[PDB]
């Protein structure tokens, strides 16, 4: 049947959660129970744009949805989510989150996030496995897939002490890894108490929020995590060349959450063993300068080589690179065709090379205040004069 | 010097060559915006610079040529790219290329009078938002108004105002 | 490309053919309304678009031709319909049609000087309220000011402002 | 259609025929007074009508011709009557008359330069207060500003404003 | 032959008839994995074969769901569309398949010397469909065992340079041999070949009568030979971007200066 | 194998060194080590047009390449370069840079720069 006229309906809906609509895409992988109302097959990625779309595909009591609520409180982001079914032992659970090609021919687990593009036109720039990246096997599958998919995987340590976070961060010297160790303590409405949360999804919602307002070259390293009430351990940002808990974990290349009932993500070093790739600003800018360069020069794979093919790409590359210097992503790029490697034997194979040097904007990691108390202006005032 | 003169022109709009139907090109007239400056203790003005004028490059085709008609009036300004090329000959036979890559808004399409026996000429005009002139493969001009750059021999003349404005 | 040029024109006013007495046609000059935009941190203007200019299509007959005289100054503006056609030849012999259906107000009728031995030419001009240019049977332009549409390859460029204004 | 062109003109001022000495006639240019109308929700103007422009018919004699000199500057405006006639020939030989009875004020008499061996041409101009154009003996135009009438095929276009103003 | 070219017997009848009819047969693999496509592509080393393995998933209006489709006909509609706008020498290898909603398997074009699914299948000489709910046909290698005939650009241009040369020189099978028969064909062949260099099909052809094999014993049989060397335009298969992050312009800006 | 599509590659290349292309030819002679990547026989002149062509024929740590980098920073010149192998004593090193016809019949050292034309159509107008 239908209805004509206006209905009113008493229905409880919980206090809307406005966020900036972001363009970044996030690859998510966690556990859920495939039931009746959960309209998702387990090892099949689904595109998510809403908390309703997360609770219609997955259960509202699932661990997918708690990770998706963790992102939608900060950014209205696009989430390619893969609902790995639960398992008994943590050896078989970590094996199911990693997954693989162990189907007939399908891709399961984290490996289904490589299917995010060509299923939904959403190639995941952020990889998150909440609660499962604490195992060293999953966090290596996060690593090798962030290298393929050209993304930043957001890890997390255990619930344990600082030294269990430092010793777990020495297992990785990879550029694409970004560990956030202290878990989030979020207030649960059902139990009416503070539930723990693995804080990887809260980083990824803020990592994608920074792309909206501040741009992908900005660091997420002082921005505000929303929807949280505290951390699992109190993290201590103090000064004085001390053993501060925020400074201990930053020197192990781990971001923390530092103030005000768990208020701000703090670090900006990635887990790299190379000082050229220390900041995630360096890793994210180089990753997304090219994704704007590539998506924008899709005409260079067709369009058979004429005389001014190599010139029309350089002036096309310089034009989509002065748009990046304009908005502040780079500072004084340099684009030119490679004069030493553009042979005609390379050109018969279809190969033609270019050089796209640029300089990234540095983050203001350590402002230094040199404060002094003087008695210089003790006579300039406080006198008859 | 050697007596040198243009003999041939060409046009590339979006990589497509107009090597059959562009009878006339016009590079943008680079004019600096002078103000005649007469002040104390002097009998004549002295013409301080105030920046560049607005650049328009115009060109004509006289076939149909959808490959230039489809760039009029897009929402994306500075999306008309385009390369004006010229070959300057010289008496001894050393042809010198003059290539002017430019970018902007195709701002007017002027199909003229259509008489029957007379050649009909579509006159176009672009509103230049980027302009680089290379002569003999060497950068002479490079003008980008937004991201204020005025390079004259590869030397950016606006590095003075760039540090003053904190750009 | 192939050297291509108009060779022949035609005119349909209200379905009636003017295949004997239109010596000259003129399609409307599509000009975008640029404002030269010079602002902070830049030495040259950049020419933002502000919409299209007003379009006038003018055409001349040189017989009496009541079938075009009876559309001047009607109470119904945008009731002059009209099809400007052109045949662009090409060197290889592939004639490409350029057909410009247009609609508007026939805004001036200019019977010129009437000397005895000299050909007398009625010059008309219409105030274009709708304009669609098809080249080789493919939509290049489609401009409808009321119901704001500016299509450039079948792609409506004003879908951005249409959702902003709630149109 | 048939290729049709004026071949011969004539002038009657007050019934008197000028069948020896009018080298050029000019019917009044009927222009509607458009205002380019750009408003909300639209990118281009649309040219609403605002009434007709002022009509001037000018003609030249090159003898003395008191029968046209004696109508300059009378106290009675709209007392210069006058019939501009034209014969449009056509290729098949069917001559079509174009007769424009008009009425107004002979507003300027311009005796030009008088050189000795050169033909001296009196240029006149009338300020048209009534204008009816008949083509092939059929009313095309009928414009009477006072008693506001604008007939385009015998159909008075101003019947809409006439009832609105209570005329 | 949509849905039937997956069998190895039909795809050989496609092969031998594409050699006769001087065409390109567009094959397709099975619905199965990548390795079933690679192992099926090793059954052919033929120049005239062009395999597109992943099937099309197209939305059916009747069942109101996504119906599978064998994707060979979607390649052939785009293969013929490229002749209209871009000409037969252009590759169809980045153009847009229309009317489709996805592929049967998600095909993965990534970088990094990896085992990308789009790069695995291109190295088995198979075109794929790569992005955006199945948006673009991707490969341009034909199934040839010869690197001289690797690209379909090479195979299609040589095939349709002659079909324009032949359909255009139908007067050379009648018109009994006079003295300037062999000269009027060369200048006719050069004229219908500078029309091809004009529009960009070739680059700097070469046409001449064969001086060593134009005997009079051949001319009594009606045989007379010509040599029609040309160079095809290469497709821009692999643009290479060598990107570097420097600290060179860290002093040129961000300073008092 | 091959690749289809566009690659991106993180690779460090050092701040290009644009120079006017010159027509003069330069005869160069210095020491290098004939190894694996150095694709030059010692007393054989080679024509050079690039810093890449100087570091492919000779070692990038060689003294030829430091002399060729010294020229390519100012002019994109043509260099007929003869890579005399190193020696212990400066009496035997100066004897090897001078060289001569002390081969079977070949020309070694500086004397191989007289072979610059008819090997490469570059008769050296500058000797260094």
From TrEMBL, chains B, C, D:
| Signal peptide start-end | none
Per its UniProt record, what InterPro entries does this chain match?
Tail_sheath_structural, Tail_tube
* UniProt cross-references to Pfam families, sorted A to Z: Phage_tube (PF04985)
Please give the name of this protein. Probable bacteriophage protein
| The organism of origin for this protein | Pseudomonas aeruginosa (strain ATCC 15692 / DSM 22644 / CIP 104116 / JCM 14847 / LMG 12228 / 1C / PRS 101 / PAO1)
From TrEMBL, chain E:
The UniProt transmembrane annotation reads: none
Residue span(s) of domain Tail sheath protein subtilisin-like: 1-143
Question: The Tail sheath protein C-terminal domain covers which part of the protein?
Answer: 144-246
Q: Which first-to-last residue range defines the signal peptide?
A: none
Origin: domain of life: Bacteria
Q: Please give the family membership noted in the entry.
A: Belongs to the myoviridae tail sheath protein family.
Q: What is this protein called?
A: Probable bacteriophage protein
Please tell me the species this chain comes from: Pseudomonas aeruginosa (strain ATCC 15692 / DSM 22644 / CIP 104116 / JCM 14847 / LMG 12228 / 1C / PRS 101 / PAO1)
Read off the lineage from the record. Answer: Bacteria, Pseudomonadati, Pseudomonadota, Gammaproteobacteria, Pseudomonadales
Could you say which residues of the full protein are shown?
130 to 386 of 386
Automatic annotation (TrEMBL), chain F:
Tail sheath protein Gp18-like domain residues are 25-83
Bilayer-crossing residues are none
What family does this chain come from, according to its entry?
Belongs to the myoviridae tail sheath protein family.
| Protein name (record) | Probable bacteriophage protein
Organism equals Pseudomonas aeruginosa (strain ATCC 15692 / DSM 22644 / CIP 104116 / JCM 14847 / LMG 12228 / 1C / PRS 101 / PAO1)
- What fragment of the full-length protein is this? 2 to 129 of 386
